[PDB]
Design a binder for this molecule. Structure first.
Ligand SMILES: NC(=O)C1=CN([C@@H]2O[C@H](COP(=O)(O)OP(=O)(O)OC[C@H]3O[C@@H](n4cnc5c(N)ncnc54)[C@H](O)[C@@H]3O)[C@@H](O)[C@H]2O)C=CC1
Ligand SMILES: NC(=O)C1=CN([C@@H]2O[C@H](COP(=O)(O)OP(=O)(O)OC[C@H]3O[C@@H](n4cnc5c(N)ncnc54)[C@H](O)[C@@H]3O)[C@@H](O)[C@H]2O)C=CC1
Ligand SMILES: NC(=O)C1=CN([C@@H]2O[C@H](COP(=O)(O)OP(=O)(O)OC[C@H]3O[C@@H](n4cnc5c(N)ncnc54)[C@H](O)[C@@H]3O)[C@@H](O)[C@H]2O)C=CC1
Ligand SMILES: O=c1ccn([C@@H]2O[C@H](COP(=O)(O)OP(=O)(O)O[C@H]3O[C@H](CO)[C@@H](O)[C@H](O)[C@H]3O)[C@@H](O)[C@H]2O)c(=O)[nH]1
Ligand SMILES: O=c1ccn([C@@H]2O[C@H](COP(=O)(O)OP(=O)(O)O[C@H]3O[C@H](CO)[C@@H](O)[C@H](O)[C@H]3O)[C@@H](O)[C@H]2O)c(=O)[nH]1
Ligand SMILES: O=c1ccn([C@@H]2O[C@H](COP(=O)(O)OP(=O)(O)O[C@H]3O[C@H](CO)[C@@H](O)[C@H](O)[C@H]3O)[C@@H](O)[C@H]2O)c(=O)[nH]1
Lengths: 459, 459, 454
């Protein structure tokens, strides 16, 4: 019977923000207050230009901002007034100690939990939205039960997020499903039903799926595991195609017409990237090693190993094709973002293709149309960067007097280039290693030009 | 030109149904299925077909005697037919080099050589049999080594995608038909000619033409992807039992992401059937042939997971019976590898039954459609005489037993009288549900006094 | 056409002697030996050459400025030459993919590209560097791209220290080339150069790959022998047999030969280990792990032999060597050279340095700056002294460690050495140079331990 009147969200990031903006927009009589430790980020949200850009987000925020939606920096009063409290802070991979470089660090989630119980009174619904390790909600509950008061009654729910970077507003206005996890006790289900009620304001009851708490946490990770698996699986197929004279695009199409298999996430590449997949896989493999599930640990670890194989063997072909040495040779790196049409570099296959060539002493010239040059120096640093790396300002400068052109990001502009011009002003034999299949179709015109072309999944 | 006479060498789970469906759809084409096995051809020409397949008996009776024939006269059949299917079995080698891993092609080769010994003029030889990549090239060399004047034999790949239990449905309305052929003129003659046969009931949009190697590899990749889904959901199942999450919940949340799909996410004791294990093992072995050890161990994980799923389940039964099962009666419900078939090939029931037989148990096995003599054959290799009993009905098997092990998801098992089953079971009585069919009946079952444990649910 | 002008890119231990010997034999041919190291070139034009090779000083001074030249000007040497030798180094890559295994072909690639940037008309490019199999296909692809040049293989078989005798009286010459018309003309042209002083029966012609691979295979067999007889020495030590008797016995069987059966602390030198590693790394790419791990045993045994010997010393010195003066007699990798590439002396010294031993190192032909360089990367200032004469090195020494078979180490006065060593005294004979001299040393009071004696 509980009705959720005011909402607070700790963490105004890529998840915290748009999620609450849409809630605000869909349920005009609910107050949505987004707070965050980073005072700048909060300010950019009330600013004309948003901290994170998502198509349609500005329209949504500007619709209810100041009406029922508020961005604020006063976290404490947001919490003590709220009915439901989202925890949407980050869980970065631990950089030291046990689980170094795989395990998730809960220090921020724990900070939200302690600050909540500090400022809370009466009844409240705490809902974690961050990708957490299974039973991380058990920690939030430990903390709350340890620091209890009279009339304090805090209920912990899981409500993970699923939006893809790029389609967030669509993916939230019209979700494939909404996921809510709660205790299978009466205090839980009441809290589950309260969060349902909020999602019912624009999400049909049929797409709202309720589970237990650990099913919901585990669901978040596994969805990413299955997706990343699909890519590693087709990538391994692409290796096999090159050895047997098959074409991986032909094999993809045939596989994906099996409706039980489906056709999404089958485009073989030089490796997947992004701030989410590899992190979640490592998180799950570390969790498994801690629950004495080595069989399961090493099952999922093959998603990473294969993705690491895909990248390393690309670099190997380049060196193997360049007469086994690539030291002091100019090489063009076309594309630095992990996927096209973005400026995000996180875990981009190009960082590692570049780092491999940099270990040989190749003189790299890098071009991305959207990535700032100073970001590329960070991703390659940690200098060896000054001697070998050079961020070019247009593609043709990168290919001038180069041995090879390496395409590492699927930018559509790379499909349009003047490979006539590039060839005259390259060293011979000129090579093209395309690791994003963007040059599919153009293979014949390129050979006759004299270009030597090697692409993933075709001999 | 038109194919007017088809011959299919191999009257098994592929050759029978696929040919019945062609005849039923192509009245003007004479379809003859041949086999070296006379009892089987006898069964085909009888009111009791040699396999149980929903709907197969109507389709056969629909045109048997008119354009559909079953004979042991292989030689005259090859001679008469325009198109010759190769649809013989391709088991894993149980001996020699690659024992336990490599595919055994002795049955393909015998077809190829019989085909050439029986052939004049023009024929299209098509292999449906799942084979290693480059396997048609062998048939092609055998034909080239034994060409006689006017002998023109074209070779095609036409992998089959039906699933047992849904064969007539899959054949009558396939997601796709895949044909692999020479990029040469004679090959395109051959491929167009086979497209014409399927174009009688299969829309041209759903007919995929590729080269021979892509076709064979697609069939392999399709099966690998499917089996991977099962191993992936099963690996999640083990993690569920350790965390308290529920695999049926997690599966559901995962499958509503349309990029993943909701098919083939039903955790089990282990996938069976003639093809998944052997096809993975084939691809893995072939990867070693071609210096691709990374790919080999990426897919090897599919089998290892499945074998761990099975061992872990056997272990629950034994650990929950205090690690001693000697002379304890155990009911085994379901011996078929899936429901709606009589095929037991590689059924998890076999491996589960064998684990319990090694512990000295008294197994009473029931299954609605698997013939009695097949079960005895599958557990022999007597241990069977001392330990194994085939039960006429499920209540007999559960009578005086310590536990019920459900291995096949036949619908009837959910409908049993467990009230009755309990009174005559030894106490404490266990139901180990290896297929999640008793889901939602757990509360009722516990009050009846039954102890129920199922894949992917924390005890 | 008769080859009238020859260029050799790379004036090292191969390009220098091999071209000196070509010039001394062929007075109607102009041989210019070039290199980027200007100090190396200048030393080749000096009364003190940049390498110690017996007979080499005579040969060079007999032609330098008649038909033998050493220049920094790489381009004109190629432009005007009829034949360009590539004799540059192919080390083991210390970086990137295959670090510690694969051969670095960056110096070959440099020649191939400078040749075509600096040459017109007809020229013969010969690969004398020890390359992997099919590396001559790579130079061919380069030349057929930036387009008339022919590519040949002519590996060298000279061993350092005997380079002059081996170049004047070779067992055989190996020339590998294309099986084409254009190729077989270029091969018989190089034969003509060698036929001035090598008989035709001892000139062997094959194809490019068979030649590139014969060089590696030959060095494998050679290195395998040493390791093989070295393994027997450890067998001898445990059964009281004697490695020299066993070796002598083995070698009387004509089918085995009597050569390369001298046990030792471990084979060194620029090539064996890198060539074995090269071939192993070749084998992985070719999906041949048995061949790979077969030849890998040639390296493991070598490393074992050195370690076993280094531990011999530490164990015998009552298990501790910290702050103890030890003499290292012999830093070159073999006798009659000053090359210290992969000398076992480096590996024993580095082992002894890890124990904190103060080393005093002597070698007749190795210059002191090389030893300091070889033993570093300070730890060296603290622990390593370089002695002007041997008796200085052994003054107050706990032990004398012989790592090189310089004939003069017999000639020493171990009466005198023993009087001024700390007690008890030890000699560790890593080359068996002291056989027969034992009883003397035993009576003098020296404790003598060598390779292959219990
Ligand atoms: N990036 C994505 O596409 C998705 C991310 N996620 C989850 O979101 C996490 C990070 O989310 P983002 O919004 O992308 O990152 P973010 O770092 O932009 O957002 C988290 C915000 O929380 C603030 N914060 C951290 N600790 C705090 C504390 N104790 N008190 C107050 N504010 C605090 C941070 O300053 C930051 O602005 C991931 O690790 C994952 O768990 C889930 C789905 C997708
Ligand atoms: N059973 C299935 O679900 C499917 C299997 N496949 C593939 O189709 C092939 C056939 O499989 P099944 O029909 O299940 O096997 P099966 O063993 O039931 O049928 C093969 C038939 O071929 C006959 N045969 C063997 N050698 C012969 C010869 N030299 N001459 C004449 N007849 C001969 C056998 O007696 C047998 O009746 C396999 O390669 C399998 O991988 C493809 C799709 C579905
Ligand atoms: N040392 C030996 O006994 C033999 C060695 N070989 C092979 O012959 C080769 C020559 O080895 P070494 O002479 O001992 O080594 P090295 O290091 O003495 O000679 C290489 C010389 O070439 C110069 N060089 C390298 N790249 C150059 C370039 N691009 N342009 C101009 N000069 C360049 C270097 O400055 C150096 O002085 C090696 O590949 C070796 O494996 C073959 C037979 C015998
Ligand atoms: O066919 C394909 C599709 C994608 N990719 C690669 O996959 C990577 C990841 O792309 P994407 O899925 O957009 O990553 P994210 O933007 O981080 O979003 C993922 O991670 C989020 C956080 O868990 C989930 O909400 C999303 O559903 C999931 O797509 C990229 O580098 C792509 O190049 C391929 O290689 N082939
Ligand atoms: O979610 C699932 C789906 C299946 N299974 C099991 O997996 C096995 C295989 O199931 P299914 O695919 O229906 O069996 P098959 O009849 O062997 O069909 C597969 O193998 C055929 C032979 O290659 C292909 O033609 C089909 O496309 C492919 O589905 C059976 O033991 C099932 O019980 C599960 O455990 N969970
Ligand atoms: O019976 C023996 C023979 C040699 N060695 C050791 O082997 C090493 C190398 O000796 P050697 O073969 O002379 O070395 P190199 O001077 O490098 O010559 C070898 O390596 C050259 C480069 O590949 C080839 O040209 C020669 O044919 C080949 O003998 C030295 O450290 C020696 O002490 C022994 O220990 N015992």
């Amino acid at each position: 019977m509980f009705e959720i009147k005011k909402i607070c969200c700790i963490g105004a990031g890529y998840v915290g923000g748009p999620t609450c903006s849409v809630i605000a927009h869909m349920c005009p009589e609910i107050r949505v207050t987004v707070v965050d430790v980073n005072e700048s980020r909060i300010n950019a949200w009330n600013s004309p230009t948003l901290p994170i850009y998502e198509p349609g987000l500005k329209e949504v925020v500007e619709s209810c901002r100041g009406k029922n939606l508020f961005f604020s920096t006063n976290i404490d009063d947001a919490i003590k007034e709220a009915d439901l409290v989202f925890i949407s802070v980050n869980t970065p991979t631990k950089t030291y100690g046990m689980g170094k470089g795989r395990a998730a660090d809960l220090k921020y989630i724990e900070a939200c939990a302690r600050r909540i119980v500090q400022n809370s009174n009466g009844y409240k619904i705490v809902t974690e939205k961050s990708t957490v390790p299974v039973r991380a909600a058990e920690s939030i509950r430990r903390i709350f039960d340890a620091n209890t008061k009279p009339n304090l009654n805090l209920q912990v729910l899981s409500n993970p997020e699923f939006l893809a970077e790029g389609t967030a507003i669509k993916d939230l206005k019209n979700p494939d499903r909404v996921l809510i996890g709660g205790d299978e006790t009466p205090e839980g289900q009441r809290a589950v039903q309260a969060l349902c009620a909020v999602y019912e304001h624009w999400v049909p009851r049929e797409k709202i799926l309720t589970t237990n708490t650990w099913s919901s946490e585990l669901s978040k990770l596994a969805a990413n595991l299955f997706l990343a698996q699909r890519i590693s699986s087709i990538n391994s197929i692409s290796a096999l195609c090159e050895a047997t004279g098959a074409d991986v695009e032909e094999v993809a199409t045939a596989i994906g017409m099996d409706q039980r298999i489906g056709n999404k996430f089958l485009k073989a590449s030089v490796g997947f990237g992004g701030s989410c997949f590899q992190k979640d896989v490592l998180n799950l493999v570390y969790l498994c090693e801690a629950l004495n599930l080595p069989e399961v640990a090493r099952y999922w670890q093959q998603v990473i190993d294969m993705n690491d194989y895909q990248r390393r063997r690309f670099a190997s072909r380049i060196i193997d094709s360049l007469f086994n040495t690539v030291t002091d040779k100019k090489i063009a790196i076309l594309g630095f973002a992990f996927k096209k049409d973005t400026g995000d570099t996180r875990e981009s296959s190009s960082i590692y293709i570049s780092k491999y060539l940099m270990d040989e002493g190749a003189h790299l010239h890098i071009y991305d149309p959207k990535v700032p040059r100073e970001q590329i120096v960070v991703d390659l640093s940690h200098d060896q960067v000054s001697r070998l790396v050079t961020i070019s300002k247009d593609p043709y400068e990168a290919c001038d007097g180069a041995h090879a052109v390496v395409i590492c990001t699927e930018w559509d502009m790379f499909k349009e280039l003047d490979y006539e011009r590039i060839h005259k002003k390259m060293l011979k034999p000129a090579f093209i290693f395309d690791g994003r299949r963007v040059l599919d179709g153009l293979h014949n015109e390129l050979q006759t030009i004299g270009f030597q072309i090697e692409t993933i999944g075709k001999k």
